Amino acid sequence: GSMICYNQQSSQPPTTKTCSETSCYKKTWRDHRGTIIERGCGCPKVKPGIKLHCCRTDKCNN
């Protein structure tokens, strides 16, 4: 069992990795300089104030 995940930063050109987990996640937050988006594997536990979107479909974090 494998999974195809996005793992690019913010609005960089899209890149792909192979997740061994059953979900890929999108993590969005805003500091003083702007918005950061982090894409990757699993469903990590995020700090309060961070938007998280986990999904179980391939190529689903963008």
Binding site: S10, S11, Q12, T35, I36
Partner: protein, 218 residues
């Protein structure tokens, strides 16, 4: 140099913010970091690279309270949604440290252990000595006085209860329960036919059932 190479090695006192986990205090391990970066220059105009994968510890003076177990340095590229061409670079040097716990073992844990041992000795003291309450109350007062030491030595953080704090609270609850139960014992010891009548369950338990597991005139 004539090549144009500049080497600049200034000293600094770094006062850095570190999430401190007191869960396992005084046996805690901490991981503290120093994030460094060009404040006003981004990665497109100034590129910073680490000199080595690890911080240099060749001239590190020995710490009497912490042992540095691990140390490494990581470079991070950060991109923002509004700017896809300019990275923001940082180098974070982290140090995993383990506290040496002997100071808090000697100056906190051992007196608490001694008070915990002294708590149970009041139950071998007979009531006719007239000293049960003196022993228990003085053990409690010794713990109350020791709370000054504990407050002065153990950090005043509310992120979590320290393990040493749990031991202190357990000991204090222990002595308080000892005092309550000793009051019950002393109230039992002065029960008289003039003011009380022995229930049949008390006789059926304490004078024949329990004693058969132990030895006394009965």
């Amino acid at each position: 140099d004539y090549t144009g190479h500049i080497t600049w090695t200034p000293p600094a006192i770094f006062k850095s913010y570190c999430e401190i986990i007191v869960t396992h205090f005084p046996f805690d391990e901490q991981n503290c970091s120093m994030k460094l970066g060009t404040w006003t220059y981004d990665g497109s105009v100034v590129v910073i690279n680490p000199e080595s994968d690890q911080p240099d510890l060749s001239n590190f003076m020995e710490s009497g309270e912490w042992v540095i177990k691990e140390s490494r340095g990581w470079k991070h590229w950060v991109f923002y949604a509004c700017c896809p061409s300019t990275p923001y670079l940082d180098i974070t040097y982290h140090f995993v440290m383990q506290r040496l716990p002997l100071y808090f073992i000697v100056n906190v844990i051992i007196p608490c252990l001694l008070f915990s041992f002294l708590t149970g000795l009041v139950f071998y003291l007979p009531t006719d000595s007239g000293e049960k309450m003196t022993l228990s109350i003085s053990v409690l007062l010794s713990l109350t006085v020791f709370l000054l030491v504990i407050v002065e030595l153990i950090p005043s953080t509310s992120s979590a209860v320290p393990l040493i704090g749990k031991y202190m609270l357990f000991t204090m609850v222990f002595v308080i329960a000892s005092i309550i139960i000793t009051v019950i014992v002393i109230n039992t010891h002065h029960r008289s036919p003039s003011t009380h009548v022995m229930p049949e369950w008390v006789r059926k338990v304490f004078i024949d059932t329990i004693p058969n597991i132990m030895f006394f005139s009965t």
